[PDB]
Amino acid sequence: TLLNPYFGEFGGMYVPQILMPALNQLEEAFVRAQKDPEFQAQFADLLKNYAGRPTALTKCQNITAGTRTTLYLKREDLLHGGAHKTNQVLGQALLAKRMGKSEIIAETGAGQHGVASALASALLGLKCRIYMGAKDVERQSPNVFRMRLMGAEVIPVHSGSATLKDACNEALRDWSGSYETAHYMLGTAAGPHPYPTIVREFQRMIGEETKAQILDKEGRLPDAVIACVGGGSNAIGMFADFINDTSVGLIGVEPGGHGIETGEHGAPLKHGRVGIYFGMKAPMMQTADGQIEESYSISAGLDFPSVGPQHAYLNSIGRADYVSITDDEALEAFKTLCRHEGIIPALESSHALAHALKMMREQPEKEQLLVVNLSGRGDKDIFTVHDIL
């Protein structure tokens, strides 16, 4: 391998022997790609011209009133696609193109990844099949249509629990055979190496911008940068360029669900033990005899039963801290952003925000510079917050 598959003890390539030439060619190609000026500029031009980067950094005006907290939001909700999924998916279809591949395989639960693979493949003339679990397909009718529309082929999984877990496997089986024509487009900084390092280098510009934008605006590095942790790309996208700025904290929010004490939650990194699944050694949600179980969260795009290897590792050397937020703490931060700043945040990112609101309400005279990663808009969620409310 050209690069290290391990972030401390976490990570690896724990895949069937047959997939290994695919992963090793993808590593070799990504190392070339990151070294080629041509690749960087084409990638940049799509981000800038098709997607809308730099995204904005908003200073919150009215949510921190009569506290000493300064909130900024990184506005990945104003990205083409209204969810940060767009910056890695462009960069990986460019890579498939640079590898001579003609198809894209992908899997989904909520829809946002499937839709973001479909919108990148339409844009670059690649054939695209999305694997989605029947439970998920039924629930995610608005996103199925949006995918079909853009020309993506949707195959309905409904084996195992018919969830993302199951969708993730079938897509790899397909990759075993298709791997020299097709490319599997993995949703997050998780799974077999090198998808942990690729999905970070293609979300890394979030950090790069938040930094120069806070430097332009405030003149000093932020104190903590909060971010939720579905499987880790948005979070590791924000953290990446701040990791060597020891003065800057990095808090990652995890789905507390109905409550840590209730089990229906998606908090593997702090309350679930290490295991081997989806080609990596990293913390996960499993029974006492190794059978992996489904996690849970109000945010569909936050319930996935493990976490990125490098997130599991930054927790171990104490460089980042991971905390939790329950469903009702997410709802309240949702209504508060709407009614106060006039931004409808995605329920996923409300978890990162609820945590920064708690930090300022609990210690009101602490002067502290915060930056939340607003990582998707909430249009998708106005029906669900309206089934609760």
Partner: protein
């Protein structure tokens, strides 16, 4: 480890190639499974390859995937699997028993403690479906220390550096799955690999005599046995009677 080496010796001295059935432990019930394995055996099975129920089989196809679900619904656990393996070994001292596995179930109680209980109930080899030769070492030393053969899959896209590694690291037999069919068998015997057993598409006797003739030491019938059990879901006499006649047909096709 050893019982394999005894099997291949015996078969060689009587011009025979091994025929090995796969089946999932606990399918479609515990009671059922033990009767099904005693029928495979008396029908002619030279060795057994068993599957333990695991959640998502990243290395297995839809048939085995819902076969695992049938055993899950039976209320089969890890604990009931080791209990089953021990009594299978009690009625049958000589036959090799190997296990298909996924790395989370090995790792879950410590890799060494799993190879410890394997050796203690009589398991001869373990193939862990999703641990590639380059993530092998903890699993490989641990098997050797409790004298359990680590089985490896040698895949169609096998580069030469792999072929050296597999031949150096497996024991028991090599699981076979660009490269001409015969050319692989040749290179493995050159590299001194353990008996290469063909597992790709063995379902009709013509292929067993094909595998035997090619230099493969015998053949593993994966999905076929499972399918006869699926067809015969609740057809119990036909379930076993078809299984009996299938294994003996397959087996007949290897003594030349």
């Amino acid at each position: 480890m050893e019982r394999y080496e005894n099997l291949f010796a015996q078969l060689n001295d009587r011009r025979e190639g091994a025929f090995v059935p796969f089946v999932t432990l606990g399918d479609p019930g515990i009671e059922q499974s033990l009767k099904i394995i005693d029928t495979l055996i008396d029908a002619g099975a030279d060795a057994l390859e068993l599957g333990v129920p695991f959640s998502d089989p990243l290395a297995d196809g839809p048939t085995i995937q819902n076969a695992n679900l049938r055993a899950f619904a039976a209320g089969v656990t890890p604990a009931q699997c080791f209990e089953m393996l021990a009594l299978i070994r009690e009625k049958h001292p000589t036959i090799p028993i190997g296990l298909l596995m996924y790395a989370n179930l090995v790792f879950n109680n410590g890799i060494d403690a799993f190879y410890a209980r394997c050796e203690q109930v009589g398991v001869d080899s373990v193939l862990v479906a999703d641990v590639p030769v380059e993530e092998s070492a903890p699993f490989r030393q641990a098997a050797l220390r409790h004298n359990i053969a680590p089985i490896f899959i040698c895949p169609p896209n096998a580069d030469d550096d792999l072929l050296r590694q597999v031949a150096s690291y497996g024991r028991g037999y090599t699981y076979l799955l660009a490269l001409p069919l015969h050319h692989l068998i040749e290179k493995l015997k050159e590299y001194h690999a353990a008996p290469a057993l063909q597992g790709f598409g063995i379902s009709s006797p013509e292929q067993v005599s094909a595998a035997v003739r090619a230099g493969a030491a015998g053949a593993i019938s994966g999905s076929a046995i499972v399918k006869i059990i699926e067809k015969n879901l609740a057809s119990p006499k036909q379930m076993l009677a078809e299984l009996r006649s299938f294994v003996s047909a397959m087996k007949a096709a290897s003594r030349a």
